Amino acid sequence: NVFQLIQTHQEKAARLPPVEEIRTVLDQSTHGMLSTFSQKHGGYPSGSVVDFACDADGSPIVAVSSWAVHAKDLIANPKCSLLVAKDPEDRTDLVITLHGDSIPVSEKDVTAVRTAYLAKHPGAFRVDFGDFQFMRIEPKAVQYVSGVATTLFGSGEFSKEEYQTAKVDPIAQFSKPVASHMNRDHAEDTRLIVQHSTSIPVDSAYMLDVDSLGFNVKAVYQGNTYKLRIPFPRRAEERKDVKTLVVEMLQAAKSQIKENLYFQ
Amino acid sequence: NVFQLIQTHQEKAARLPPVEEIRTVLDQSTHGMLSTFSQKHGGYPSGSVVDFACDADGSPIVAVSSWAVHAKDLIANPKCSLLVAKDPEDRTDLVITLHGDSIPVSEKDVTAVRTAYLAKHPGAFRVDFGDFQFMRIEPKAVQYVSGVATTLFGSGEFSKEEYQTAKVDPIAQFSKPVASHMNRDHAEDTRLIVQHSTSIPVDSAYMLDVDSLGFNVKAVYQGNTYKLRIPFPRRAEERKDVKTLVVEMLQAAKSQIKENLYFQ
Ligand code: NI
Ligand code: NI
Ligand code: NI
Ligand code: NI
């Protein structure tokens, strides 16, 4: 395993600041693991898998059925936690915990909240949203742990005010269409860019997520899978800048290969 | 989507009884989401991702660090829940919740428990297991919900005694080597078997898990991904019977294709 050899470079690779990384990942996430605690449940705290959509302040909105085992606890027992694992398998990868208080969405805000929720679960309400109670989890504390995004600096916490005032990275929303496209039509271009960036001649590089400062890949080299941070040459300021920076990176990789051949 | 068309057949497909399915899935699982509750944490219940290994009675053994944010709660606050999602993404797939009480593993049992834990996380103790406290989660209740394995009958619960007296399916332990092999060397054979079994001419079928009564696939047909239950012609009684039954299924698929061609 040669990840240990580029540990230092990977540590230095341009990334969002932690609070913006946590704000962005939560904003882009659609499901997580809710921990609740109710009277009438033997004194056992409970876990459930829930869908949610962050509102503009980063408060998860959950559509809670009174029939949903454990998740129904939110109705009446406001204190909860929501756990979001950027990649559920990878135990070195970023895990975010939000402690907060579930607040019913007031009649006035239902339409505005229902709209916002559908802009992350397109294909809900297929029967009826009248079968559910919209709850907003107002955060009290946001904690994270990581061995991939960062190990030494891979733990931290934020107040409600720090989290709420953090900006969602405006490029991150284009992750699935950009990655989709690269991985379908340009997989060998991602491979060449990753080799140039990291100096590991990877078998393959599958693009995972993008932000204004670069993109993350899952790469394979000699049997082993590596999560790698691939920084852009400079910050992307608009959606169009992502293609420009990817092409520039590919041209720089190809230039390096040609010059090396000139020098034998 | 043509899954709705084979709903009835898929409901009837031979499967383990629910308590044996839950006992087996938990026995074969290596990580889950722990819900804990501590004093000195604002009255917020907390979630964490933990590794575990079920003991022979099906009690999850967890190696708990006093430094692990939230999971350290187990040390001192025995009442917890462990959530295991057979496939974390798929919100129709089986989700198991165990409510139980964390009990420290006595000095006497440490070696016997440490051994048992390593037989599910081979490559722990790489530094030291002296850095951790082994806790056993004694179950009080085991609950499940499913939309794949079963929807109408896709919810239930078991007592400690019902869960503990259930048998782990003895073929399930061979899931990863059998699936590995089929998916690497015999993927088109899995495809043909799935088409014969379900009458959907699937693009591909990736074998997921096996038990004494059959195997589960993730299949693709015209853009859409389907989880399908593929029952054996009869129960497998030993590891060797799995290859025999798979070959028999492939021969039956090929015979059906030939006879159809004889009849034009
Ligand atoms: Ni319960
Ligand atoms: Ni293109
Ligand atoms: Ni906390
Ligand atoms: Ni073979």
Examine the fold and report which residue of B132, B165, B198 is the final residue of a domain before the chain moves on.
B165
Rounded distance, CA B17 to CA B128, Å? 40
- What stretch of H or E contains A225? strand A224-231
Q: Which two tokens stand for residue B166?
A: 């259930």
Q: Both A114 and A225 in a single domain? A: no
Q: Is the dihedral of CA B51, B55, B61, B63 positive or negative?
A: negative
Q: Both A200 and A216 in a single domain? A: yes
Residue A230 lies in a domain: yes
Beta bridge partners of B158: B142
Residue B249 lies in a domain: yes
Residue A8 lies in a domain: no
Q: What's the CATH number where A92 sits?
A: 2.30.110.10
Examine the fold and report which residue of B137, B165, B193 is the final residue of a domain before the chain moves on.
B165
Strands B46-51 and B133-145: unpaired
Rounded distance, CA A62 to CA A59, Å? 10
Instruction: Show the domain range for B40.
Output: 17-165
Q: Both B153 and B206 in a single domain? A: no
Q: Is the dihedral of CA A155, A161, A164, A170 positive or negative?
A: negative
Q: Both B132 and B38 in a single domain? A: yes
Would you call B43 and A69 a contact, using CB atoms and an 8 Å cutoff? no
Establish how many alpha carbons lie within 13 A of residue B99's alpha carbon, considering only the half-sphere containing its beta carbon.
20
Would you call A99 and B31 a contact, using CB atoms and an 8 Å cutoff? no
CB A69 within 8 A of CB B155: yes
Q: Both A158 and A219 in a single domain? A: no
CB B106 within 8 A of CB B32: no
The tally of domains found in chain B comes to 2
Long-range contacts, stretch B197-203, CB < 8 angstroms, 24+ apart: B197/B228, B197/B230, B197/B231, B197/B249, B198/B6, B198/B9, B198/B10, B198/B228, B198/B230, B199/B6, B200/B2, B200/B6, B200/B226, B200/B228, B202/B226
Q: Both A179 and A197 in a single domain? A: yes
CB A213 within 8 A of CB A231: yes
Q: How many CB atoms lie within 10 A of CB A261?
A: 8
- How was this model experimentally determined? X-ray
Q: Is the dihedral of CA A54, A59, A63, A69 positive or negative?
A: positive
Opening angle at CA B236, ends B231 and B239, nearest 5: 125
- Nearest residue on chain B to A144, judged by CA atoms? B69
Examine the fold and report which residue of B143, B165, B187 is the final residue of a domain before the chain moves on.
B165
Nearest to A46 among B44, B69, B81 (CB): B81
Q: Both A110 and A71 in a single domain? A: yes
Q: Both B83 and B160 in a single domain? A: yes
Taking contacts as CB-CB distances below 8 angstroms, the residues of chain A near B70 are 97
Q: What's the CATH number where A245 sits?
A: 3.20.180.10
Q: What is the resolution of this structure in A?
A: 1.8
Strands A60-64 and A133-145: antiparallel
Q: Both A49 and A132 in a single domain? A: yes
Q: Both A180 and A119 in a single domain? A: no
Residue B176 lies in a domain: yes
Residue A155 lies in a domain: yes
Taking contacts as CB-CB distances below 8 angstroms, the residues of chain A near B100 are 44
CB B35 within 8 A of CB B46: yes
Rounded distance, CA B145 to CA A187, Å? 38
